[PDB]
């Protein structure tokens, strides 16, 4: 149940680097690697956005053991859920038992630039589109002919011809209680991120997951409880704090992060923050016991799949540090 | 610039097999390998449809030399043009100089079941969509900020952050003179298929490509002129003939192929064809000299990139035969 993984940051690295880093994750003992799914990075200057599905396939072909998936992909606006279904069914066939689809309700930054017409929908409709799309994708993963007449999406006699016998597991990202309950009800997996305060995890997210599971008569023990642990570990404490600079946009409000449609405007807002405000969001440590105590909290709070997001450009260095300094402590 | 290639038939093989077949192509001396892009196969029974883009990335990671591309992908309906541009830019970064985007105007078979609302648009619109979508993806591949307000597609301030310098070559499929002229004007490459009669190639397609290049003040010599060669070579004459049976749907009329939206309806129409009729579309040969002479006609007519489509389930057999019997004669 306890798994240790690596977050491959498409917002920060070009395609070949993003793939090699994930390969290095396996070399260094990681159980999983997850890739963000962006059309546009958070920053204009020095941002990247390699296509997530190409990363998954290239990494799958180069690895033997890593569990691979999106953290996370929005299957509802720029993407056609039927094509996403095909894509993941195909990767499920290529890399058996090694693929998951992580899903999210979306961010304007990926969607408005890519041609979505009119106003960025309110939360109710984005949440509503996500539930429906998950329905449709799973109906397709059955491998049977599908007639689907939803409020957002249609299918008439569609089949996925190549799909693994048990389909494709779905992990659901939630920043609040409403989607977390949905994840407890409907997800094979639950995704959240660290550093937003204990109350969020203990009082809102985990009770909502548990209550969703209860609502659908499910064992909560059966849901993979995954978190992206924002960690900046370096024996040089000056480097540990400074390394967080690139990730300044993640320190903006949820509202700014999901409604700002332009990287230029995003980066403007984000570079108003001093480094010591940005570091609020990150586990900043240069002692490994200090580091693992802080990571240990999430475990205590009910998360079992720990996906490590290190902020610096030197990812190979984080991975060496992780394998020698943190992994032995974290595994117990 | 004679090039010999392999057609990987997504409609006939499962995902893992499709990828290993294209790896075996490289092992057998091929310069390129190209994949069909389907959501739904021609046949319901025995049919497959692995995701084309996952095939390309998995094959790319496994190979060193093959040119890789779609033959062909419709970038106008179920696919978002922006995302196709991102996907291919990413792949071009992963496999420098080994990626091309093959494009077509589409077929109802991939589009109607996958949830296109309303009536399958007439040719004028499909062509006009293709032209516009190709324009938009090319603007994105520049790497600059793009504002695009087409008749069908929209971008408001989109960039692709990861593009190779020297872009993504776009190859344009045509079955008639109108789109062939467009391939002439706009295409890095031109795609057609064999066995449709001398006059189509010599009087319709090739003159249209030349006309297009001339009207765009471009060299026709510089355009890659790719044909899928439908060839059933086997020293056993029984196999040479019978191996074509699976490809009966390809001997249906053009209107049927691009209009029938259900593989069950497609298969039924195809199953009413006699083997004699199917054979018409294929070079059926059990002698290497005769086979190469038949393939050589297309070289005489102006085609230079010969992508071989063998109809049998035993694709490894074909590849071995191609390597020992066909390739030495074809290279000249
Ligand atoms: C913000 C909102 O909805 P939500 O669905 O929980 O959160 C928004 C999504 O999680 C978010 O917009 C994106 O899909 C974020 N998603 C990413 N989205 C992407 O499109 N690409 C990514 O790479 C990505 C990374 C990612 C990783 C972890 C994670 O938790 C989220 C990530 C919310 O708070 N909703 C309600 C209350 C809101 C309301 O008005 N009622 C609730 O759940 O209680
Ligand atoms: C047939 C029609 O238009 P066209 O653009 O030539 O359409 C045929 C297309 O090439 C066709 O619809 C598809 O995109 C088929 N296409 C595939 N389309 C796919 O969606 N997936 C594929 O895997 C695929 C493979 C393929 C390979 C080679 C090839 O040449 C075509 C293939 C036509 O006759 N057009 C006009 C005349 C019509 C008119 O009204 N005037 C003309 O070009 O002169």
3-class DSSP assignment, residue A70: strand
Q: Residue A228 CA: which ligand is closest?
A: 1
Cα separation, B136 vs B180, in Å, equals 20
* B265 to chain A: closest CA residue: A157
- Catalytic residue chosen out of the listed positions B11, B26, B107, B228: B107
Cα separation, A323 vs A321, in Å, equals 6
Q: Residue A249 CA: which ligand is closest?
A: 1
* Residue whose structure tokens are 């085609």: B303
- Largest pairwise CA distance in chain B: 59
What is the separation of C-alpha B210 from the centre of its chain, rounded to a whole number of angstroms? 20
Cα angle A246-A247-A248, degrees, rounded to a multiple of 5: 95
Question: Do residues A58 and B94 touch, judged by C-beta distance below 8 A?
Answer: yes
Judged on CB neighbours under 10 Å (0-12, 13-18, 19+), B103 is buried
Chain A residues with CB under 8 Å of B23 CB are: none
Q: Which of A23, A49, A57 to mutate to test the interface with B (most CBs of B within 10 A)?
A: A57
Contact B154 A54 (CB under 8 A): no
Strands (E), B150-262: 154-158, 170-173, 189-193, 224-233
Strands B32-35 and B3-8: parallel
Contact A94 B39 (CB under 8 A): no
* A87 to chain B: closest CA residue: B51
Residue B95 has, within 13 A of its CA and on its CB side, a CA count of 24
B59, two tokens? 């094959």
Q: Which of A19, A20, A44, A93 to mutate to test the interface with B (most CBs of B within 10 A)?
A: A93
Helix (H) or strand (E) holding B241, with range, is helix B237-242
- Would the annotation count B105 as a binding residue? yes
Contacts of B85 (CB under 8 A, 6+ apart): B136, B137, B140, B141, B160, B168
Chain A residues with CB under 8 Å of B40 CB are: 158-159, 161
Positive/negative CA dihedral, A149, A155, A161, A163: negative
Q: How many other β-carbons are positioned within 10 Å of the β-carbon of residue A254?
A: 11
Residue numbers in the known binding site of A for coenzyme F420-(gamma-Glu)n are 37, 74, 105-106, 110, 175-176, 178-179
Q: Is the previous residue joined to B72 through a cis bond, with omega within 30 degrees of 0?
A: yes
- Catalytic residue chosen out of the listed positions A26, A28, A38, A267: A38
Beta bridge partners of B283: B231
Beta bridge partners of B101: B170
What dihedral do alpha carbons B28, B30, B31, B35 form, nearest 10°?
A: -120
Quote the minimal CA–CA distance from B259 to chain A in Å.
Answer: 15
Cα separation, B34 vs B9, in Å, equals 8
* Residue whose structure tokens are 């900043």: A284
Q: Which of B12, B16, B58, B62 to mutate to test the interface with A (most CBs of A within 10 A)?
A: B58
A82, two tokens? 């039927």
Our answer to whether residue B38 is catalytic in this structure is: yes
Helix (H) or strand (E) holding A109, with range, is helix A108-111
DSSP B77: S
Choose one of B38, B74, B116, B173 to mutate for the ligand 2 pocket test, by most ligand atoms within 8 angstroms of C-beta. Answer: B173
Which of A223, A227, A232 has the alpha carbon at shortest distance from A193?
A227
Cα separation, B242 vs B311, in Å, equals 9
Which structural domain, as residue segments, surrounds residue B324? 1-332
Question: Do residues A219 and A233 touch, judged by C-beta distance below 8 A?
Answer: no
Cα separation, A104 vs A256, in Å, equals 16
Cα separation, B96 vs A18, in Å, equals 16
How far apart are the CA of B271 and the centre of ligand 1, in A? 50
Provide the domain count of chain B. Answer: 1
Which of B274, B63, B298, B332 has the alpha carbon at shortest distance from B202?
B298
3-class DSSP assignment, residue B193: strand
Query: Which value, in Å, is the radius of gyration of the alpha carbons in chain B?
Result: 19
B293, two tokens? 């002479």
- Please write down the long-range contacts of A276-279, taking CB distance under 8 Å and 24 or more positions apart: A276/A241, A277/A251, A278/A244, A278/A245, A278/A247, A278/A248, A278/A251, A279/A232, A279/A241, A279/A244
Q: What is the CATH number of the domain that holds B111?
A: 3.20.20.30
Cα separation, A85 vs B165, in Å, equals 32
A287, two tokens? 């002692």
Chain A residues with CB under 8 Å of B44 CB are: 159
Beta bridge partners of B22: none
Cα separation, A194 vs B10, in Å, equals 42
Our answer to whether residue A38 is catalytic in this structure is: yes
Q: Is the previous residue joined to A83 through a cis bond, with omega within 30 degrees of 0?
A: no
Question: Do residues A321 and A236 touch, judged by C-beta distance below 8 A?
Answer: no
Choose one of A100, A107, A199 to mutate for the ligand 1 pocket test, by most ligand atoms within 8 angstroms of C-beta. Answer: A107
Question: Do residues B69 and B60 touch, judged by C-beta distance below 8 A?
Answer: no
Question: Which residue has the least CA distance to atom 38 on ligand 2?
Answer: B123
A83, two tokens? 């094509």
One DSSP character per residue, A22-61 reads HHHHHHTT-SEEEE---SS-S-STT-----HHHHHHHHHH
Closest Cβ–Cβ partner in B16, B19, B82 for A115: B82
Cα separation, B65 vs B25, in Å, equals 11
Q: How many other β-carbons are positioned within 10 Å of the β-carbon of residue A151?
A: 9
Cα separation, A85 vs A70, in Å, equals 13
- Would the annotation count B37 as a binding residue? yes
Cα separation, B254 vs B263, in Å, equals 15
Strands A3-8 and A32-35: parallel
* Residue whose structure tokens are 């957002």: A152
3-class DSSP assignment, residue A294: helix
Cα separation, B291 vs A113, in Å, equals 51
How far apart are the CA of A136 and the centre of ligand 1, in A? 20
Method of elucidation = X-ray
Helix (H) or strand (E) holding A216, with range, is none
Q: Which residues of B65-99 are buried (b: 16+ CB within 10 A; e: fewer)?
A: ebbbbbbbbbbbbbbbbbbbbbbbbbbbbbbeebb
* Residue whose structure tokens are 């790719």: B226
Question: Do residues B171 and B100 touch, judged by C-beta distance below 8 A?
Answer: yes
How far apart are the CA of B297 and the centre of ligand 1, in A? 59
What is the separation of C-alpha A216 from the centre of its chain, rounded to a whole number of angstroms? 24
* Residue whose structure tokens are 């392999």: B6
Question: Do residues A36 and A137 touch, judged by C-beta distance below 8 A?
Answer: no
Taking each helix axis as running N to C, give the angle between helix B81-94 and helix A52-62, from 0 to 180 degrees, rounded to the nearest 10. Answer: 40
Q: How many other β-carbons are positioned within 10 Å of the β-carbon of residue B176?
A: 16
Chain B residues with CB under 8 Å of A58 CB are: 57-58, 60-61, 94
């Amino acid at each position: 149940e306890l798994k240790l993984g690596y977050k491959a940051s498409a917002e920060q690295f070009a395609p070949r680097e993003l793939v090699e880093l994930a390969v290095a994750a396996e070399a260094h003992g990681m159980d999983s690697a997850t890739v963000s799914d962006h059309f546009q990075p958070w920053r204009h200057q020095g941002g990247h956005a390699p296509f997530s599905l190409s990363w998954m396939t290239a990494v799958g072909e180069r690895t033997n053991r890593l569990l691979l998936g999106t953290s996370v992909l929005t299957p509802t606006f720029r993407y056609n859920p039927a094509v996403i279904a095909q894509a993941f069914a195909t990767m499920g066939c290529l890399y058996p038992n090694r693929v998951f689809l992580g899903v999210g309700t979306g961010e304007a930054l990926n969607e408005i630039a890519t041609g979505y017409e009119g106003a960025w929908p309110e939360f109710k409709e984005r949440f509503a589109r996500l539930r429906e799309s998950v329905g449709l994708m799973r109906q397709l993963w059955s491998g049977d002919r599908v007639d689907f007449d939803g409020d957002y999406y249609r299918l008439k006699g569609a089949s996925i011809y190549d799909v693994p016998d048990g389909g494709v597991p779905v992990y659901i990202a939630a920043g609040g209680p409403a989607v977390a309950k949905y994840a407890g009800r409907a997800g094979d997996g639950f995704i959240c991120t660290s550093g937003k305060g204990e109350e969020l995890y203990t009082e809102k997210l985990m009770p909502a997951v548990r209550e969703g599971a209860a609502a659908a008569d499910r064992s909560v023990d059966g849901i993979d409880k995954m978190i992206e642990i924002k960690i900046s570990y370096d024996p040089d404490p000056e480097l540990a704090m400074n390394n967080t600079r690139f990730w300044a946009p993640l320190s903006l409000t949820a509202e700014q992060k999901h409604s700002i449609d332009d990287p230029i405007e995003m980066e403007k807002a984000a570079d108003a923050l001093p480094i010591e405000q940005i570091a609020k969001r990150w586990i900043v440590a240069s002692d490994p016991d200090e580091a693992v105590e802080k990571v240990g909290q999430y475990v205590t709070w009910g998360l079992n799949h720990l996906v490590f997001h290190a902020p610096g450009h030197d990812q190979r260095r984080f991975l060496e540090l992780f394998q020698s300094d943190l992994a032995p402590r974290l595994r117990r």
